[PDB]
């Protein structure tokens, strides 16, 4: 008999350990694999697909309108929308990105925020999206916003504008759980010129916003999510 010494920890059940164990069904032959499209290997693959952001979460209950960002005709230099960038909470909390991000404690990388115009073809507009890196407050007027990372979007044949939110940080990782030290900054949109509608047109004009991750992206330290419960 080989002399051994059991170390502390013996007998413990660490839900995270990865060891071998005897099979309760010896010689069982599992069903053959067949081809199935859409195989997923890493969650980082799917958070690169963008989903709609319920930016206009100003309603009494959940509704399609929560995803519609109102745009008003003949308004000038005024603010269209705003939000901080705690991707694990706020407007982002229910999105695919936010949902997956919440399964991890740390995140890093660049975000892909885009806007798709849905107003009549014969209408025009020029907006300005702006990312305000941490350190200062969320911009209160276009001038303040324009001083930082931004994109002037000209509504046209190409319906969608894609503004990237470049990873701008000192520490190389932030917490998914809203934390001040690791805040990501603010996102805002303003009128560069104004929205102009054609004759015989009075209907409301809306914007659809999407959020996804760039290949830049990283997530660490898997944990349970606050997005489900029972009992």
């Amino acid at each position: 008999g080989l002399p051994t010494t059991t170390l502390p920890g013996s007998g413990q059940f660490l839900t995270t350990d990865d060891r071998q164990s005897p099979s309760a069904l010896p010689n069982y032959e599992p069903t053959p694999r067949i081809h199935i499209p859409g195989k997923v290997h890493n969650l980082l693959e799917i958070i690169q697909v963008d989903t709609l952001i319920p930016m206009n979460n100003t309603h009494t209950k959940d509704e399609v309108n929560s995803y519609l960002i109102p745009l008003n005709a003949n308004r000038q230099n005024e603010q269209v929308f705003g939000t901080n960038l705690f991707i694990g909470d706020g407007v982002f909390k229910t999105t695919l990105l936010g949902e997956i991000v919440q399964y991890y404690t740390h995140w890093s990388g660049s975000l892909r925020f885009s806007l798709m115009y849905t107003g009549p073809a014969l209408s025009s507009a020029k907006l300005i999206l702006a990312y305000t890196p941490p350190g200062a407050r969320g911009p209160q007027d276009r001038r303040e916003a324009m001083l930082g990372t931004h994109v002037v979007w000209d509504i046209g044949l190409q319906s969608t504008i894609v503004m990237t939110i470049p990873w701008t940080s000192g520490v190389q990782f932030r917490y998914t759980d809203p934390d001040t030290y690791t805040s990501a900054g603010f996102l805002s949109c303003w009128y560069q010129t104004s929205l102009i509608l054609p004759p015989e047109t009075t209907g409301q004009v809306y914007l659809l916003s999407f959020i996804s991750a760039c290949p830049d992206f990283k997530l660490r330290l898997m944990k349970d999510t606050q997005t489900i419960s029972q009992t």
Binding site: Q20, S21, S23, P37, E45
Partner: protein, 41 residues
């Protein structure tokens, strides 16, 4: 990494897939779209 058991199910976790191709989800379009070129030409 010596397998003490006879069946495959007994072995431990597989280790990183190292495939990582998001395009089947991010770009499932019929006609290839080049970044920088008109989305709708």
């Amino acid at each position: 990494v010596i397998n003490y058991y006879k069946d495959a199910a007994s072995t431990s976790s597989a280790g990183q897939s190292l495939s990582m191709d998001p395009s089947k989800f991010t770009e499932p379009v019929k006609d290839l779209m080049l970044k920088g070129a008109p989305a709708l030409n």
